[PDB]
From a paper:
The three Protein Phosphatase 1 ([name]) isoforms regulate diverse cellular processes, acting in partnership with over 200 different [name]-interacting proteins (PIPs). The four [name] (Phactr) proteins are novel PIPs that are implicated in cytoskeletal regulation in animal models and cell culture settings. Here, we show that [name] confers sequence-specificity on the [name]/[name] holoenzyme. We show that efficient catalysis requires interactions between conserved hydrophobic residues in the substrate and a novel [name]-[name] composite surface, which comprises a hydrophobic pocket and associated amphipathic cavity with a surrounding basic rim.
We determined the structures of purified [name](507-580)/[name]α(7-300) (1.9 Å) and [name](516-580)/[name]α(7-300) (1.94 Å), which crystallised at pH 8.5 and pH 5.25, respectively, and exhibit differing conformations of [name] residues C-terminal to residue 567. In both structures, the [name] catalytic site contains two presumed manganese ions and a phosphate anion, as previously reported, and its conformation is virtually identical to that seen in other [name] complexes, such as spinophilin/[name] (RMSD 0.23 Å over 255 Cα atoms). In contrast, at pH 5.25 [name] C-terminal sequences adopted a distinct and poorly resolved conformation, perhaps induced by protonation of the three C-terminal histidines.
Residue numbers in the entry:
A (entry chain A): 7 to 57, 60, 60A, 60B, 61 to 299
B (entry chain C): 512 to 576
The structure:
């Protein structure tokens, strides 16, 4: 795998006017999928990470915004990164986005990590853009190759035994972390149950306990569910993504949960900032914002 | 190990703010061109795809209610 060449071509478009494509060969992309999949399967499904670390939320194929976030935080290996999922769909350049993220996972496998979002599953990204982008620029078989790779992404991470990270949220069925660790990969994301909830659930300030979810999938959870979960597992913070928030980050339940969304001006339809959370080695957490002007 | 029962996290009073690039992020919305018959076909395509070629461990859901 000519990995350095691939990263060079992906980064070559930094000085370009947004929208310039990077058309790697199909075989290079398959190589990124195959080698990253092997690494995902060799590492835990519940990651145990240590700070310093940069944590990013949704990207949704906004590749030129991803390039600016790395400029902001330092390109690997200058900084360590945990991404909370939703690399593809909705944006103009999902293929460049996932290829750069997969290439950096292969290049720096102990310092660069990707979680699974709800858009990293066949049923969702068949519809919301990634399949169409694969088919237009390559072929359907390549989308199936990505699906196999996505089916092996890890599901959650714990930073410094204190920050629980996943894409969506909590689950009424999540009593022990061991329940996450026993999940075998590759796996699809079912339309209900523990793995679905980790990728799909939402906090809600108006709900007591567990409520129905307006997406028609999973649940909402209230502030006391978060507090009880943090206390039982000796955790300090839940870090999740999954929802567009005006400032790029948004606290819930007296800063016991934070939502991160890293795609500014999302889809060209929202006026939102994108944010990353930087965790230094003393567990001081700070927010870096990319705001529309 | 780094765990403990004491609260260790802190949040900084400073927030770093920088400007996003000014570009057109509007993208094509192919799913808006799908009819009902289109969606029905795709559901069957996905069904066949998962039933016959997507490798997994036949994972699925638990329930008790
Ligand atoms: Cl596994
Ligand atoms: Mn989402
Ligand atoms: Mn969304």
């Amino acid at each position: 795998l000519n990995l350095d060449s691939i990263i060079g071509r992906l980064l070559e478009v930094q000085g370009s006017r947004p929208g310039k494509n990077v058309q790697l060969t199909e075989n290079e992309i398959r190589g990124l999928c195959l080698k990253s999949r092997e690494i995902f399967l060799s590492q835990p499904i519940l990651l145990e990470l240590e700070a310093p670390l940069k944590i990013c939320g949704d990207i949704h194929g906004q590749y030129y915004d991803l390039l600016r976030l790395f400029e902001y935080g330092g390109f690997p290996p200058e900084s360590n990164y945990l991404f909370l999922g939703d690399y593809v769909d909705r944006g103009k350049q999902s293929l460049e986005t996932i290829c750069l993220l997969l290439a950096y996972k292969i290049k720096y496998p102990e310092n660069f990590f990707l979680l699974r979002g709800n858009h990293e599953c066949a049923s969702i990204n068949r519809i919301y853009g990634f399949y169409d982008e694969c088919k237009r620029r390559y072929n359907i078989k390549l989308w199936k190759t990505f699906t196999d790779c996505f089916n092996c992404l890890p599901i959650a991470a714990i930073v410094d035994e204190k920050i629980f990270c996943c894409h969506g949220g909590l689950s009424p069925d999540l009593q022990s972390m061991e329940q996450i660790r026993r999940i075998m990969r590759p796996t699809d994301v079912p339309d209900q149950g523990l793995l679905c909830d980790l990728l799909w659930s939402d906090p809600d300030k108006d709900v007591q306990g567990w409520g129905e979810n307006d997406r028609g999938v999973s649940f909402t959870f209230g502030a006391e569910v978060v507090a009880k979960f943090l206390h039982k597992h000796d955790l300090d913070l839940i870090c999740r993504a999954h929802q567009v928030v005006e400032d790029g980050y948004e606290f819930f339940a007296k800063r016991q949960l934070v939502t991160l969304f890293s795609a500014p001006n999302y889809c060209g339809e929202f006026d939102n900032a994108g944010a990353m959370m930087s965790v230094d080695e003393t567990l001081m957490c700070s927010f870096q914002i990319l705001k529309p002007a | 190990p780094l765990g403990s029962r004491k609260i260790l996290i802190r949040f900084s009073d400073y927030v770093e703010v920088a400007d996003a690039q000014d570009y057109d992020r509007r993208a094509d919305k192919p799913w808006t061109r799908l009819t009902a018959a289109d969606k029905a076909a795709i559901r069957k395509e996905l069904n066949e795809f998962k039933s016959t070629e997507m490798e997994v461990h036949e994972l699925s859901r638990h329930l008790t209610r």
